Design a protein around this ligand. Structure first.
Ligand code: NAD
Ligand code: NAD
Ligand code: NAD
Ligand code: NAD
Ligand code: NUC
Ligand code: NUC
Ligand code: NUC
Ligand code: NUC
Lengths: 260, 260, 259, 259
């Protein structure tokens, strides 16, 4: 049992035990949710089937959100076992690595901009389009954003724009799907060393600096994010939609804390 | 049991079964919290002792947050049974009624401004000052705000300023008390017909208009707010501090929905 | 001597006397800037040439911001007469019109999303990239956004996401180009019945509701926007960068009028 | 003919040549406004009289915004020479200095809170109340805020709550007085080492950190603020009301510099 008791939730973006999505699925399973999982490529298929089985799940489906056909086929497959379900977790963010390195205006390109927005923002509503009919009243959709949406952060570059697009997507999706009984929210997570840190310069220094100046004096964990995510996909959060909830330890609401 | 299992939480502001604080205490008791209650005047003493006893609580204490002595005496009394505890719910908002009626610049007065800010904003940190030593690591403080803080709303008038002050109070309190292990948040609730609606002109029309244009197509309840409040005072929300969480059905994130 | 007196500013997006960019151009000329103009396509050439002539400009250049080579060629042409200059006004917004009716989730498509973000957001930084070495210290870049970036507005649909991207683009560009002396801002303008209102359902009522609830009790004009734009590209605004300035008469800061 | 050319504006808060209000007054005079000045107390009279004389003004009036009768008497005096006028600059911020060291929860008191909100927030609407019938259509009111209203800044403490109240006051005043032709805005200025830095711990490093992380790579000046203030009280900004304009060089829109 748990406060996600009679709920069936699809979880994207589990790539490793460090993934934010892994922490979310963990917390959701602990709270009684029945889970289903997607995986981007075949390289990831073995790993996700394993994590799903640890969390009581036989439903592991391929989904590359670059492709409308892949999304449709995956929801068609899901419908064979979950004719209806209660929402999904969107934990997919991507820009070509060279976009995330230097001066933003020099780094950004039309293609890097296109990919970053396509994969990190459009895919969320593409997923909602494809399963809109499958959602129960009381369903909840969730995505992961970052402070780069609201502030100019060195090297985050075009992902910052893509996350700002995603946060607007949350609002427009909540406004369109609310009347039929679906809520849509985001968590704006503090930095976490996941595979999304691969190749990012000065990530350790960024983490240290966050730990010093966040009001809770630590960086957040996939367990912190998972607990908030479970809440936001549960009926306990029935009054919250279209909201970007900061799960950052309070980092974003303070300033000039570094000066001791 | 529940996710507030080993937690002792003080609840202010229970005035009637309609109070937001009543809904919060209900949800908190359901989730296993041990509760204590304050009451403003003796007129309210009988009623609150009753609600507290329904929720398994013998701890009902007088507290007029206009008075530093009253706050100190109440925490001294509380310490006799709760030497330490795990946070409190601040559900106190007040401005002299004549402040909340007409054109803001004509209505507001120095004294109405003083009272509104004193009772609705300063009292939150006055309460934290008085019990700071009593708080356990992992404690959480919560207050109730309203969209009037962020937007100019007809007739809300100086309460709008007082709520903006309160939301800044949340941030400064979270920044000062985080390192020692206390989180501080607010819920920005949608309108609810409580005793805070007494004498407010066009409250029914305001409620109707909210129900039409909120993405979830209903107004929020003290049960919605109570569930979010329970979460935000629980260890499930360990990664959230200094945040104003909108529990408004998405009302604040949409615009020009009234035009059908 | 106006407060843009020694400045040379490139103005995109003039398509009619109703355009926001026409109001911006007039104001900037009124304050003594020297101006240059771009036109999207051959359909619009003759009109932009005429408008530029009325404002005393000989510099009228094609620029279709869908294409990197079009932007590059335009700035190479501009460099023949303006080897360095002091910024540009980005007044370009576009999504396929089918994107802007009805339920947002049903209306949006991958291609409609792509185009809206490419044309309305990426093109701002694409332009900055192509002219970065031509920008004098003290330069200012300016774009136009809308409250649909911040709040879910019926029918604005994917343009709201595109504008949210554009406002983030403002911050990232300001952060990147500030050290070399360039400021980057946006105006978030209230609704104006320009060519950008074409085919949009219930535009007249939206203005009417806006005229009723805005604090100043009227909708804004391209004159209002042009005056704020001139300030934002002038040295008077040397302390402002990365900012989205609301020029909507206070509409966005109000709530709960009419019920 | 400057862009405030036919305007009469009352300027509060000139206490030294370093004051933000001194930079605002100079800019407004430069743009052709006629000016009037208030002074808090007898300590400051002689200096404000001198400054007003340098800017060509004979109108120098006492006003202690702690007291309703002081504000009323000042506007009665002003009405003898300016029966109607076009707005005022509110440049008044104050909390007892013990409020602005150390841990916020330990530093704040009921009285320190009262004073900070009374003097820094209520006094803006108190002034508007006392001169409302004297305001010409097209009038503009302006106040100064700081980023401590929006984010928790060490040591700024209760002034951050007071500034958050003041920014809400801007919105509520703009909403109330817009129908009669008055706009109300604020400038959220970056840190400037004025008399308001007196006794504030680590002010020099805060400027140094600010100079490093702000996009424009310098802190702002009273010249930068005065130019934005002149625009905001001029008819050039007729489309802007209820707005908090950040004039901090883009500091607030950045994060994660230095680590
Ligand atoms: N790690 C942080 O600091 C942090 C903080 C806030 C938000 N985020 C965001 O959290 C979300 C999860 O990232 P993470 O930190 O768990 O790292 P991660 O690498 O473990 O998860 C990212 C997942 O995106 C999936 N993905 C990428 N392209 C895809 C595609 N075309 N189709 C389907 N799936 C695709 C990947 O397979 C991966 O599983 C991302 O959106 C990220 O931007 C990360
Ligand atoms: N009802 C709404 O629409 C709504 C929406 C958002 C926020 N709020 C806020 O929620 C909170 C609770 O209000 P409510 O709607 O439950 O109405 P309510 O009247 O039931 O609760 C308000 C409580 O404030 C207490 N109070 C007032 N002055 C006090 C004092 N000097 N000392 C101690 N206690 C004092 C009162 O006793 C009352 O119990 C308030 O802060 C209110 O501003 C209300
Ligand atoms: N009219 C409003 O209510 C309003 C309010 C706020 C912001 N805006 C925005 O202001 C800006 C100007 O819009 P407007 O109202 O003046 O309408 P408009 O139609 O007069 O201007 C739009 C211009 O964008 C140009 N454009 C479109 N695609 C282009 C491309 N691929 N390459 C080059 N140019 C291209 C068009 O030629 C046109 O000149 C837009 O960004 C719009 O989103 C409009
Ligand atoms: N200096 C900064 O870093 C900074 C940045 C942003 C905003 N501000 C704000 O700008 C405004 C002007 O401050 P400043 O930096 O020019 O310092 P300042 O000391 O030169 O100006 C403050 C003025 O407030 C006046 N004042 C105080 N109490 C008063 C009262 N009861 N009645 C009448 N007048 C009273 C004072 O006489 C003084 O003239 C303040 O509101 C300040 O909070 C300052
Ligand atoms: C913090 C922070 C993060 C983590 N986080 C918030 C994200 O959203 C990270 C998305 C992200 C998207 N695409 C990526 C990668 C990461 C890198 C590996 C992947 N293999 C890749 O090729 N492309 O990334 C940053 C980048 C620059 C500066 C700061 C940060
Ligand atoms: C919505 C809405 C609310 C409810 N809510 C958000 C609040 O915060 C209400 C605080 C509030 C404070 N003080 C009050 C009262 C209410 C009135 C009864 C009490 N007996 C009194 O004397 N003084 O109040 C409004 C007032 C005007 C316009 C809209 C609203
Ligand atoms: C307000 C408001 C506006 C004006 N505005 C702020 C904009 O940014 C309008 C961009 C926009 C982009 N692409 C468009 C068009 C318009 C339509 C004609 C053009 N010929 C077209 O084919 N495609 O448009 C709206 C649309 C729906 C709801 C509200 C509004
Ligand atoms: C930045 C910054 C400022 C400047 N600034 C934005 C303000 O608004 C400063 C208001 C302020 C109000 N009251 C004060 C004083 C200052 C101190 C001298 C005066 N003589 C006094 O007695 N009381 O002050 C800070 C204080 C702590 C941390 C950061 C800052």
């Amino acid at each position: 049992m748990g406060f996600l008791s009679g709920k069936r939730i699809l979880v994207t973006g589990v790539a490793s035990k460090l993934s934010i999505a892994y922490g979310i699925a963990q917390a959701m399973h602990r709270e009684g949710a029945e889970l289903a999982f997607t995986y981007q490529n075949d390289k990831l298929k073995g790993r996700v089937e394993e994590f799903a089985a640890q969390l009581g799940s036989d439903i592991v489906l391929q989904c590359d959100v670059a492709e409308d056909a892949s999304i449709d086929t995956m929801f068609a497959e899901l419908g064979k076992v979950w004719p209806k379900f209660d929402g999904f977790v969107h934990s997919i963010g991507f820009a070509p690595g060279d976009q995330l390195d230097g001066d933003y205006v020099n780094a950004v390109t039309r293609e890097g901009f296109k990919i970053a927005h396509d994969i990190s923002s459009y895919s969320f509503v593409a997923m909602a389009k494809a399963c809109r009919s499958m959602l129960n009243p009381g369903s909840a959709l969730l995505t992961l954003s970052y402070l780069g949406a609201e502030r100019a952060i060195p090297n985050y570059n075009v992902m910052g724009l893509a996350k700002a697009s995603l946060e607007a997507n949350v609002r427009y999706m909540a406004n369109a799907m609310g009347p039929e009984g679906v809520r849509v929210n985001a968590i704006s997570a503090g930095p976490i060393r996941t595979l999304a840190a691969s190749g990012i310069k000065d990530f350790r220094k960024m983490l240290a600096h966050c730990e010093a100046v966040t009001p809770i004096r630590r960086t957040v964990t996939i367990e912190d994010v998972g607990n908030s995510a479970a809440f936001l996909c549960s009926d306990l959060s029935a009054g919250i939609s279209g909201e970007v909830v900061h799960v950052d330890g309070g980092f974003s609401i303070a300033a000039m804390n570094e000066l001791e």
